[PDB]
């Protein structure tokens, strides 16, 4: 559906409400514990989320573009179309990019469904393409984008986001960009919903600067010593200046959200069958979301520059960074701008203000607990919490909370609300969660906690229950790709659900941030190594040595395939002994070239997304051994990803990607 309509407050007016929305909010959290904490033998439903860049083809000038405006699709999904959608089992909805989709199946799957989350996907595919072409008749017709075809591709990043001619629309610098202030983003980057340019405007007030993101450049033998896609610029004090003071020799500079939300990826929701499950599942994979991250790279580059890393995290991570100077333990870039670091923070507030380690865009900062390998000392990191949230979720007469619980929400909540309407100011907490939601749903993590609403009582069996969303992995460009991630997860998560006496998954958080910082490095998959528990079949044992990422998907003792999916798919009958039984199986031929996707993947014999796009810019040969990333270069190389996406083998590219055996095989077989 369409997020509903209002009028956003911005930052200067609505930070008066802060303590208002988080106390409500609270309240909503608890009456939601009330009325379904304790829901049981919720099914296994779940469901994937993929999100799409429309990109406009201009293949005569060798240019590919963001098209920026058939943004019209989502409401049309959402109208007259939307029995198309439904009849179809598809769901659309608007993401920060205007030139982005969204689009999930419309019913969640319910245990294990094959090859159907491969189908909804391409179904998803094709009512956008299918729209597309509509609009390109209708163009026609009147004159409009000339010698222009848009394409729907799943690329994680848009490979020349904000450098020149990279939106689809004449001469977009003739006016300013208010909301962002960047440099290099246009704010015509950003959905029409308000929603999207508020939350752009706020952040940047609180922050007072300019959010920041510099991502190590790829050294190459002829490449700049700094970013000189740097200008100096006149539109916006402070932010116009900010840039030369906020850069840094040898990396990609960027400036807006929109490099960051303006980013997909896949992420994956699962419904346990009771909150103490859910707890335990959450737990368990928060060590799995570093590893999938490397494991799954596809964001070799930004802003036209190779980067020296492989995934999106850190950039989306500081694309929303409202951390003020003061916050993140630092002086202004600009102190006659940025007040004392406070930046936009209330003056009758700053007394109470803390040092905040990680942006609210950040890997999960506490287990939650309450399984019997939990063990507090387990959450060993730097983690502030809102005190006065910590006491009333201890202490109240609707659901007091354990201190683990208690200390998850409280650390959540030391953020202010960064998007509010007026007319959502005063709600009934009884039936309403949407105050939660405000800060719910901009604590962006590698995993999500998700209570359900209040109308999830017991009794309710159709309801959502307590859900754990799954958020690393950077989104591929087949459908083929993503239906396999999304099915490893299943099985991983399905693994966990089934043998929830026998594994203990606990290790230190600390080890687990220090995998997302190596989960970042080029070619991590290929020889890094992560902390990996020793063993999971073991109560007390914390125990971690270092394992590649071949060895975490393979080792027998403690690897993902002989540890969570052969043990899951011999309990279904899959196979007796082996995962390699389903080459031969009837049913199941398909499960098999998904596992050898993973399987080649992780152990290097076949290369990432990200690994794919760093050769094709490599051994390009327009590439001027500078690290830069030309409009040629970029249109060939989403040239060949349209064709990728499209099984066509016609240069040999998807051979090349796949290998000949995935390749042949997806494409002399459907998905049934
Ligand atoms: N594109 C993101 C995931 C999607 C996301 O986090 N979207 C933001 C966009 S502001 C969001 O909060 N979406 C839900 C909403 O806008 O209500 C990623 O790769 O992690």
Not at 70 to 78: A, G, P, S
Not at 102 to 108: F, G, H, K, Q, V
Request: glycine share 4%; aromatic share 12%.
């Amino acid at each position: 559906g369409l997020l509903a309509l209002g009028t956003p407050l911005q930052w200067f007016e609505s930070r008066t409400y802060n303590e208002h929305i988080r106390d409500e909010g609270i309240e909503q959290l608890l009456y939601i514990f009330q009325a379904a904490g304790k829901r049981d033998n919720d099914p296994l439903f779940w469901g994937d989320e993929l999100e799409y860049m429309v990109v406009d083809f201009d293949d005569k000038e060798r240019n590919s573009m963001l098209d920026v405006c058939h943004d019209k699709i989502l409401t049309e999904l959402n109208m007259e179309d939307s029995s198309l959608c439904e009849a179809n089992d598809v769901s659309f909805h608007p993401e920060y990019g205007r030139y982005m989709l969204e689009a999930t199946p419309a019913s969640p799957y319910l245990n294990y469904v094959g090859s159907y989350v491969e189908v909804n996907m391409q179904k998803r595919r094709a009512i956008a393409e299918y729209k597309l072409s509509e609009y390109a008749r209708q163009d026609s017709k009147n004159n409009l984008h000339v010698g222009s075809r848009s394409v729907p591709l799943t690329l994680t990043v848009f490979p020349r986001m904000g450098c020149p001619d990279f939106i689809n629309i004449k001469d977009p610098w003739n006016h300013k960009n208010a909301a962002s202030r960047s440099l290099f983003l246009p704010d015509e980057v950003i959905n029409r919903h308000v929603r999207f340019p508020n939350l752009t405007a706020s952040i940047r007030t609180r922050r007072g600067e300019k959010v920041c993101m510099n991502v190590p450049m790829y050294k190459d033998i002829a490449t700049p010593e700094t970013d000189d896609s740097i200008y100096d610029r006149d539109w916006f004090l402070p932010e116009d200046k900010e840039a030369k003071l906020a850069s840094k020799p040898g990396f990609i500079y960027m400036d807006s959200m929109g490099f960051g939300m303006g980013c997909s990826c896949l992420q994956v929701t699962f419904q346990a069958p009771n909150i103490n499950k859910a707890r335990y599942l959450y737990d368990a994979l928060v060590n799995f979301a570093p590893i999938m991250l490397a494991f799954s790279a596809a964001a070799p580059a930004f802003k036209g520059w190779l980067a020296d890393q492989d995934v999106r995290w850190n950039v989306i991570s500081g694309a929303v960074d409202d951390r003020t100077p003061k916050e993140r333990g630092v002086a202004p870039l600009l102190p006659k701008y940025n007040k004392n670091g406070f930046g936009g923070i209330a003056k009758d507030v700053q007394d109470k203000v803390l040092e905040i380690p990680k942006s609210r865009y950040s890997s999960v900062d506490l287990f939650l607990g309450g399984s019997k390998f939990f063990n507090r000392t387990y959450n060993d990191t730097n983690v502030p919490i809102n005190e006065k949230v910590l006491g009333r979720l201890l202490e109240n007469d609707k659901a007091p909370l354990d201190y683990d619980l208690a200390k998850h929400f409280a650390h959540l909540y030391i953020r202010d609300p960064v998007s509010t309407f007026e007319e959502l100011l005063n709600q009934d907490n009884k039936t309403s969660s949407n105050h939660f939601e405000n800060i719910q749903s901009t604590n962006w993590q590698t995993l999500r906690f998700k209570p359900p609403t209040q109308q999830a009582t017991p009794d309710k069996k159709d309801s959502p229950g307590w859900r754990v969303e799954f958020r690393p992995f950077e989104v591929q460009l087949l459908d083929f790709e993503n239906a396999a991630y999304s099915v490893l997860i299943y099985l991983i998560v399905d693994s966990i659900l089934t043998f929830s006496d026998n594994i203990n998954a606990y290790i230190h958080m600390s080890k687990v941030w220090e995998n997302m910082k190596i989960a970042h490095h080029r070619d991590a998959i290929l020889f890094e190594k992560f902390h990996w528990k020793k063993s999971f079949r073991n109560d007390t044992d914390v125990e971690t040595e270092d394992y590649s990422i071949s060895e975490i998907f393979h080792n027998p003792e403690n690897g993902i395939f002989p540890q969570f999916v052969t043990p899951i798919l011999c309990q279904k009958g899959f196979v007796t002994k082996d995962w390699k039984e389903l080459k031969h199986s009837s049913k199941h031929e398909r499960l098999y070239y998904y596992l050898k996707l993973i399987s080649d993947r992780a152990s290097g014999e076949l290369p990432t997304t990200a690994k794919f796009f760093r050769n094709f810019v490599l051994q390009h040969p327009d590439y001027k051994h500078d690290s830069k990333i030309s409009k040629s270069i970029n249109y060939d190389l989403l040239s060949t990803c349209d064709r990728l996406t499209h099984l066509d083998d016609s240069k040999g590219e998807l051979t090349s990607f796949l290998g000949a055996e995935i390749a042949e095989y997806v494409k002399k077989n459907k998905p049934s």
